[PDB]
């Protein structure tokens, strides 16, 4: 029993983290097979970030300008290329610690673990979610760029996020491992405001199921609702509309607990309209939306890797 | 910027996790040098746990009764001994992945990372704290026993916790790596109720400093207090008394932010007496007490390992 915000074990990713330095800028890179992936703004000075022309800046760089260090040992760079907002540095040695891996582009609402790194060295690991406005709420200091987000399925690491930017509002933006930003953000120091940070309804419902499984059941009530009626309330409170697809994804948790999805929606509706009255659910005084249905099933069943 | 509940990177500990089976019971063990550490109740059946005589039960076990598996490979057990509530299984092969390590017994209020494991396989990593009543609020299912808690200082893993028991109230109890339980708990399935779960005041204050460093400052007020006056309020709200030692530990955060410790105490006093009025601090609607002062300094400065 007990339910915690849990990250994936980070060892398989720790073995892939390297330091990349170009001129005066140092950040993190991801070393998989004989390629190191990192943010293309490693080629930029602080001045450059206000209005960078990446193709022009890259012309002034050669292979030997990219200093790649794995722990204490230097890697030899034998080619480089830009793909969208990432650089791919071809090195002469395949990483012997390369795990089974895939690159995935995740959808808003999906969760992943972040290995925060500085100078190629891991500092910590935590769980977060791709927000509906395509930001993430991370913990990234200067030098953390190139830190990655990932999920693990048994033996295979699915990399989904590379950190690039902090917005002036303190939230974070980055790319998939093909170098395409999530959402509308760009790797330039300019005015980019995030859209509404809406709540991930299906994740809140999943977490309410986790709460029931673990004995927190005060919020269960005598009511039910419909999708359309629930969604009138979701709109008022800046929650994502619940779809039939979401109802289907919650099917396993509904079956396990015997609580119909629409009955849990009616519990959520009452929590939205009346608040929690100073009570807590799974140690939280607000409705948590960074556990997916699959996260809840995984943690409640003990799936390993 | 951003502040997250962050666990230590778990790779160094993942490389030490093994499966231990004795008769019909399987749990996790920790393989360091040529010793595997695990809970002594691996020798117990479900019946045994109601009133176990461990010395008598252990007499019926030999080295070959302890099946130790590291991934897919079996380890040869060449001796075994009981130390308090742990078993030490001497194996014929030193773990080649043994990190630099120490065994530490932590004090209440201190935090650590847990690598939840099942059948010797890591499932997830999360941060928690030794509560003042000597329980922890973890996420442990059947088979998680022997999972460990740890801190990392650069290259050295300090192991501080091994999981043994879930209390009927759903909180968790375990030992240090010398096999001594934290608090009054015993490895028997009996009535053990936890004492008051008091709030770790110095950690709440540290987290308020983290909030100010990251821009959340609405709770700062025009007031100050004294230690004795603050402690009258702490007692009323089941907070640990704040000592001069705690004030000294918060010195670095006070210096960095320019907010005197007693001024932050007065902010906390107002938060206790008036609540948060539906507002949040660092994404939380309650006062968080599982970040130590050293955790805040570490995460706010980017310390790596």
From Swiss-Prot, chains A, B:
Active site, UniProt feature: 41 (for 3cl-pro activity), 145 (for 3cl-pro activity)
Ranges for domain Peptidase C30 come to: 1-305
Task: Tell me what happens on changing residue 205 to V.
Answer: In strain: Zeta/P.2
Biological role: Cleaves the C-terminus of replicase polyprotein at 11 sites. Recognizes substrates containing the core sequence [ILMVF]-Q-|-[SGACN]. Cleaves and inactivates human TRMT1, preventing tRNA guanine(26)-dimethylation of tRNAs. May cleave human NLRP1 in lung epithelial cells, thereby activating the NLRP1 inflammasome pathway. May cleave human GSDMD, triggering alternative GSDME-mediated epithelial cell death upon activation of the NLRP1 inflammasome, which may enhance the release interleukins 1B, 6, 16 and 18. Also able to bind an ADP-ribose-1''-phosphate (ADRP).
- Stated regulation of activity: Inhibited by pyridone-containing alpha-ketoamides compounds 13a and 13b. In turn, alpha-ketoamide 13b (tert-butyl (1-((S)-1-(((S)-4-(benzylamino)-3,4-dioxo-1-((S)-2-oxopyrrolidin-3-yl)butan-2-yl)amino)-3-cyclopropyl-1-oxopropan-2-yl)-2-oxo-1,2-dihydropyridin-3-yl)carbamate) inhibits SARS-CoV-2 replication in human lung cells. Inhibited ex vivo by michael acceptor inhibitor N3. Inhibited ex vivo by compound 11a and 11b.
Tell me, how does this one assemble?
3CL-PRO exists as monomer and homodimer. Only the homodimer shows catalytic activity. Interacts with host FBXO22; this interaction promotes the proteasomal degradation of nsp5.
Q: Give the highest taxon in the source lineage.
A: Viruses
Reactions accelerated catalytically: TSAVLQ-|-SGFRK-NH2 and SGVTFQ-|-GKFKK the two peptides corresponding to the two self-cleavage sites of the SARS 3C-like proteinase are the two most reactive peptide substrates. The enzyme exhibits a strong preference for substrates containing Gln at P1 position and Leu at P2 position
Span within the parent record: 3264 to 3568 of 4405
Give the residue range of the signal peptide: none
Record localization: Host cytoplasm; Host Golgi apparatus; Host nucleus
Protein name, entry field: 3C-like proteinase nsp5
Instruction: List the coiled-coil residues.
Output: none
Provide Cytoplasmic-side residue ranges: 1-305
User: Location of the Glycyl lysine isopeptide (Lys-Gly) (interchain with G-Cter in ubiquitin) covalent cross-link?
Assistant: 5, 90
